[PDB]
Design a protein around this nucleic acid. Structure first.
Lengths: 65, 116, 151, 65
RNA sequence: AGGAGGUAAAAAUGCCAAG
RNA sequence: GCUUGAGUCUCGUAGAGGGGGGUAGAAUUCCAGGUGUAGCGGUGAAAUGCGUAGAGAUCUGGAGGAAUACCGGUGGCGAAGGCGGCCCCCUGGACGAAGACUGACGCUCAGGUGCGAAAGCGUGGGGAGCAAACAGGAUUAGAUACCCUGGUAGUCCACGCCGUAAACGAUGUCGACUUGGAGGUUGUGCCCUUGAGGCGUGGCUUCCGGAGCUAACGCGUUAAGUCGACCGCCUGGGGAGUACGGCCGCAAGGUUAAAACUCAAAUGAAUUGACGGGGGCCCGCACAAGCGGUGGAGCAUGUGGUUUAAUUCGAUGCAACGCG
């Protein structure tokens, strides 16, 4: 959010707002309550998370790299 | 003129348009310039370049005050942000500190339903 | 095309004085594969301009190129929704090759008597950059600078 | 990866602003349990501790006050 | 590994066809 | 009689379980004022709208209503509907440890009774933000729509009513039995807590999968497996969850629930294709980058059409039309 670092400025380099939001809470509350589409988009967000965790623990076949 | 030395640059980088207002420390405005005022009516004002010329067109609107120290307050989602600060640095202002004052509610007002 | 990034051709130099850039210019002036006809026009227009310019042939020629040689031009690219014009920098081999085209189409619109007189008039007043050939280059720079917002 | 009061046993008290400052970020938001590796029991505990400490102005709600 | 974006991220219109 | 089922007590633990009352900060809008200058807003692009009566931007002050960022998690709790700031008051349930007690008190349940999202209805409040209706602007062949600018009911509170939902894990409740693996969460025992460990043992929960089952998809100790007890329900599609009648309701309607007639199917899962204004990858003068044409003119020639006694027949998107 707030940035000084106080001597050798020279460049913006604001990862600081990206380390908190930079769009992520603002391009979310831009519109559209939905009130239940969070409950289904959180679920597939978790479902794709645990499926790729099952995928990366199932890569060892050969595939000839 | 009052000839103040230290000032605050506010940047209202919305999705459609960007407004660069340079004030003093207290908050009283000195001059401003938007992307719509610099030409660019329509799709062109929503680009980072129109934000850049809006900051330059605001820098020479406060030449009569002799500001040398600027603290930037960026606010908004728009593409203005990371280009309209660089235009103030090239304009010959010393960037004392940057902060984002983007108003994020602590969850309450119903946002619009819009845009299917 | 899709696959091939082909290397360019092998132009032989100009016979009067060895220069591929003049040799490329006589190809853009050529029509119907009549190269000897087009070389007749180029030499007769370069000598009657070199008298008016004072400078000798090639350096009188190439100074008239930078007044029509562009540097940016628009292209119509689509990335998001509807398509708009982005100004792109012109690569240098194209850059004078696009300039030579604008001259010989400006000289073909000229209402003078012969092509030698037409092209020498167009190549001279472009050295004082007043022809319509520079006005092509000014108008490609206007709509490029009108679209400077896209980069 | 590391732990918290699972070893250095505590029943988190909100007045310990020294320890609680470790568990908020620079903007004052509570840092998630996926970062600090806190047990889910204590992450509920310090969430109530921070929310009480914000009420008594011992901790700020945001950085923009 | 998940997260966020990025000249960029879309959303102008675009009907019908019979045994 | 007995103690395993069921229940009680003692001790703790976790929790957006409920009801009441307070209060907190962030933001939106409005109101007032300072500064300040021509735009703002909006979109694919626009316009309506707002703005020189000085907006938008910025700063200070205020008034309001509503919702609770981060924590936050296929995390938790609840019979289900559901329930997220914090604090107090009142209150329900679950689970655990170690004992004590009652002694089959149990399970299920037609009718009955209660609870029951949202919308709606009644009365009285409240009204920031959203927003049916409605209005204006667009888009379009049209656009009673999507999009934009506004905007009333409603959303909020109290108290009644309605009693429905894709009220859904589309899976009734209760009990027993039957290989495993990785987790989450919440208790607890033991040991060297020596240190985040080690070993156990309970409750709830997510995912994968074995036997088995299944039409298949899949389910798989939280079964759709193997069984038992009781209940609800089904009997081709359409007509139709409609008409009529009853009951309920302020109403909207709900609930119970046909028939004539009509069709020879309707449907489920999966398969090979084709297609997609689905995705990924790739190619071609397909586009792009270029050059020269055609469409205009006059003729040549072929076809259609018309005409004629006959204008012989055939070829008719690409792939017929200087074709046989």
């Amino acid at each position: 959010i707030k940035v000084r670092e106080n001597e050798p400025f020279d460049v913006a380099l604001r990862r600081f707002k990206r380390s908190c939001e930079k769009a992520g809470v603002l391009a979310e509350v831009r519109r559209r309550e939905f009130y239940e589409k969070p409950t289904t988009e959180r679920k597939r967000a978790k479902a794709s998370a645990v499926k790729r965790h099952a995928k990366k623990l199932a890569r060892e076949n050969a595939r000839r790299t | 003129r009052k000839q103040v030395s230290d000032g605050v640059a506010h940047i209202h980088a919305s999705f459609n348009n960007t407004i660069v207002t340079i004030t003093d420390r207290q908050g009283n405005a000195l001059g401003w310039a938007t992307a719509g005022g610099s030409g660019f009516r329509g799709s062109r004002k929503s680009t980072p370049f129109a934000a850049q010329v809006a900051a330059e067109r605001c820098a020479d609107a406060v030449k009569e005050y002799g500001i040398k120290n600027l603290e930037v307050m960026v606010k908004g989602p728009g593409p203005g942000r990371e280009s309209t600060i660089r235009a103030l640095n090239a304009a010959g202002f010393r960037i004392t500190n940057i902060t984002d004052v983007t108003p994020i509610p602590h969850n309450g007002c119903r946002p619009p339903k819009k845009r299917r | 095309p899709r696959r091939r990034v082909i290397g360019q051709r092998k132009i032989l130099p100009d016979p009067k004085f060895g220069s591929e850039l003049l040799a490329k210019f006589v190809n853009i002036l050529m029509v119907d594969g009549k190269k000897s006809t087009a070389e007749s026009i180029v030499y007769s227009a370069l000598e009657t301009l070199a008298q008016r310019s004072g400078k000798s042939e090639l350096e009188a020629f190439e100074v008239a190129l930078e007044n029509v040689r562009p540097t940016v031009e628009v292209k119509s690219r689509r990335v998001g929704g509807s398509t708009y014009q982005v100004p792109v920098e012109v690569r240098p081999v194209r850059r004078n090759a696009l300039a030579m085209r604008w001259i010989v189409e400006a000289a073909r619109k000229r209402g003078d008597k012969s092509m030698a007189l037409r092209l020498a008039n167009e190549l001279s007043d472009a050295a004082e950059n007043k022809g319509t050939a520079v006005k092509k280059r000014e108008d490609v720079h206007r709509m490029a600078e009108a679209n400077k917002a896209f980069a | 990866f590391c732990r918290f009061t699972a070893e250095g046993v505590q029943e988190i008290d909100y007045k310990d602003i020294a320890t609680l400052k470790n568990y908020i970020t620079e903007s004052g938001k509570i840092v998630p349990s996926r970062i600090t590796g806190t047990r889910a029991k204590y992450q509920r505990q310090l969430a109530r501790a921070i929310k009480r400490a914000r009420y008594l102005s011992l901790l700020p709600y945001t950085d923009r006050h």
